[PDB]
């Protein structure tokens, strides 16, 4: 079928600021594996329904993947505000698709911190929907140029998740997969059985 397994069952996930996107098209997909499962902590869908989606077609389907905290899963939704929504991953108000998240304490948490999962902490303006900002330029909080060195009024824009297995459920990492469905007036390359 369509490479859904390569996304959900991926060995390693990307940081939320550098969220990966996989283009799924020109294939026939089976959606039964997802909603029948129970390992998904949250399965929220806007506009479309995974049940009754098996006998449907779509022109383009995107699979966005990233890792965030439990507290920040609620921000992956249309019309939501917060550090993750504003500065890392923003969904449009007319979003059509699903957001799927599950706990990954066993996979992404490491003793002494992961050091590799990062989220954007400082940004002068909010992200537009489906925008990825991978800049590591030093954030200039004042009028003095930073010259690419951290210091007063000059911070590193990215903050590292201290993912540890001894944290609470909220602090534990969650792997999030966002499915975006398009049915534009065009030949439909993504269909079910």
């Amino acid at each position, epitope marked *: 079928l369509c490479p859904f397994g390569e996304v959900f069952n991926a060995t390693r996930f990307a940081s939320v600021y550098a969220w990966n996107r996989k283009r799924i098209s020109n294939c026939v997909a089976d959606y039964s594996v997802l909603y029948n499962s129970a390992s998904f902590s949250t399965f929220k869908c806007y506009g479309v329904s995974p049940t009754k989606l098996n006998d449907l077609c779509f022109t383009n389907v995107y699979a966005d993947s990233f890792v965030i905290r439990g507290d920040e899963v609620r921000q992956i939704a249309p019309g939501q505000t917060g550090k993750i929504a504003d500065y890392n991953y923003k969904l449009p108000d007319d979003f059509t698709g*699903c957001v799927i998240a599950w706990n990954s304490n066993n996979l992404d948490s490491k003793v002494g911190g992961n050091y590799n999962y990062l989220y954007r902490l400082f940004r002068k303006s909010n992200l537009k929907p489906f925008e990825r900002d991978i800049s590591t330029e030093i954030y200039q909080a004042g009028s003095t140029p930073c010259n690419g060195v951290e210091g007063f009024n000059c911070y590193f824009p990215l903050q590292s998740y201290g993912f540890q297995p001894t944290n609470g459920v909220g602090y534990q990492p969650y792997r999030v997969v966002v499915l975006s469905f398009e049915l534009l007036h065009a030949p439909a390359t993504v269909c079910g059985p």
Partner: antibody
Amino acid sequence: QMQLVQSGTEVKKPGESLKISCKGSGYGFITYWIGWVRQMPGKGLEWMGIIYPGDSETRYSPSFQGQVTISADKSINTAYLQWSSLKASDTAIYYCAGGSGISTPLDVWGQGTTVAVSS
Amino acid sequence: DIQLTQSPDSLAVSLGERATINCKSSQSILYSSIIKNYLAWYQQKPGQPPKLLIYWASTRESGVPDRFSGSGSGTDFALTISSLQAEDVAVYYCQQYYSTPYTFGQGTKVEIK
């Protein structure tokens, strides 16, 4: 498919508190949102509100937000509609419907719960 | 918020003929990414809870008789029943699921001629 079962018939008085139940049994309740519909005696359907059991995200109709409260318990796959001060106008039959997402049709419906409030 | 008016309130159609129930919308119910109008049709037989018949105003639910069919776009939509039977005698509602809050029509009773 999925199925919904509601609570039983109740007759109350103006000034009492009431809480009704709607438990869903099926395959894939994680994807389902639960709504509430009121049908006044010999009248049409009225949409009250909706809730997602996983995070209890509750949305209310502007005509019902101030006097109803919708809750859920994902442990028992049950949604609840509750009142504090019942009124004679609340006398109706209440249905709960289940959709597989927001902005989706109500595929699954409950059998309904009859409420009567009078002096 | 988004209104939905039906017509006619009552309708009597003889067996084997065609029924027509109209549904007018205050705003367009068409999405940008899916290009399908978010309208649904329901059937509520007496004593029984409403049952979903047609979603997206064109697609029929599984187990629905082929005589039921949906049509319309923009703000004008309709439900048509060809070769009417006694089972199709119920009050029909059109409901939008474009955005919360959901709204229903006032209902359309289908009597017998």
